[PDB]
Amino acid sequence: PLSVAASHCQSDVRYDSNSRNRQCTCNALMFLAVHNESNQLQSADLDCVLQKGDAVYSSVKRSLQNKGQFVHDFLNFDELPSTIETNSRCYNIVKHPQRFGFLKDTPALGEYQNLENTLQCLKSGLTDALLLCGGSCIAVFRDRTGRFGYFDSHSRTPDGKYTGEKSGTAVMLTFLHLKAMVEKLLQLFQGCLQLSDQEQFDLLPVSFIEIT
């Protein structure tokens, strides 16, 4: 795929240890709002996503701590904010019914399918979604010109592989064919992150209502 790389990733030391490397669900949500405003994001736009997403995480964490509802580190879909601000715009978040499945397994239950077949919903069924699997969250999308892609706020090489080197950055990867993106996502989840065939993934389609 084609790649746009940020200059850094969410574990960068510029983020306070309070939020460092815990912001991915917020970064994925912020990405989908910014990408909806403009598909052709530049590297500096992804940097801005990481900055605003970290700020959102810190605000939500503070809110739940004042309410005594903070125990774990990565915010789940239930703890995501209901409103989000980009550069100049503000949106209410519409959470749609979640989809669940397994990376490769397809239990005889029948209802839940594997990742490849579940993500077929991106052809028309929906355009923007958060994808959580094995404690890692990414954003997946179908863009205005019918391309498929995802945004990964973790430490990645330009081609989307995990790296522990300080050269790793967040990346957005864009594909002409959905099948190519599915293969890449399986390389990420099962190759780089070593997640097993029976690992469950959680898909949250989101839409945005502009409130200026």
Residue numbers in the entry: 0, 300 to 321, 601, 323 to 510
Show me the paper's own sentences about this structure.
Deubiquitinating enzymes (DUBs) cleave peptide- and isopeptide-bonds downstream of ubiquitin. By performing a comprehensive bioinformatical screen, followed by biochemical and structural characterization of interesting candidates, we were able to identify active members of this family in a wide range of eukaryotic species and a few host-associated bacteria. Due to the similarity to the herpesvirus proteins, we refer to this extended enzyme family as VTD (for Viral Tegument-like Deubiquitinases). While some VTD activities resemble viral tegument DUBs in that they favor K48-linked ubiquitin chains, other members are highly specific for K6- or K63-linked ubiquitin chains.
To further elucidate the structural basis for VTD activity, we solved the crystal structure of DrT1-VTD2 (residues 300 to 520 of Uniprot entry A0A2R8QBC4) at a resolution of 1.90 Å and compared it to the ubiquitin complex of mouse cytomegalovirus M48, the only available structure of a herpesviral tegument deubiquitinase. The asymmetric unit contained one DrT1-VTD2 domain, which was completely resolved with the exception of residues 107 to 109 located in a protruding loop where Leu108 and Gly109 have rather weak density. In total, the structure contains four α-helices and nine β-strands, which adopt the form of an α-β-α sandwich, in which a bifurcated antiparallel β-sheet is flanked by α-helices. In VTDs, the catalytic histidine and aspartate residues form an invariable Asp-x-His motif, while in typical DUBs the catalytic Asp/Asn residue follows the His residue at a variable distance. As a consequence, the catalytic histidine (His453 in DrT1-VTD2 and His158 in M48) resides on the opposite site of the catalytic triad, creating a mirror image to the classic papain fold active site. To confirm the predicted role of Cys322, Asp451 and His453 as the catalytic triad of DrT1-VTD2, these residues were mutated to alanine and tested for their catalytic activity. Ubiquitin-AMC assays as well as incubation of K48-linked di-ubiquitin chains with C322A, D451A or H453A mutants demonstrated a complete loss of activity. When the DrT1-VTD2 residues 403–411 were replaced by a short Gly-Gly-Ser linker, the enzymatic activity against Ub-AMC and di-ubiquitin was completely lost. However, the quadruple mutant DrT1-VTD24mut (F398A, P405A, A406G and L407A) completely lost its activity against di-ubiquitin, suggesting a complex multi-factorial recognition of the ubiquitin Ile44 patch. Individual mutations of both residues (D376A and E377A) resulted in a strongly reduced chain cleaving activity, and also a reduced cleavage of Ub-AMC, the latter effect being more pronounced for E377A.
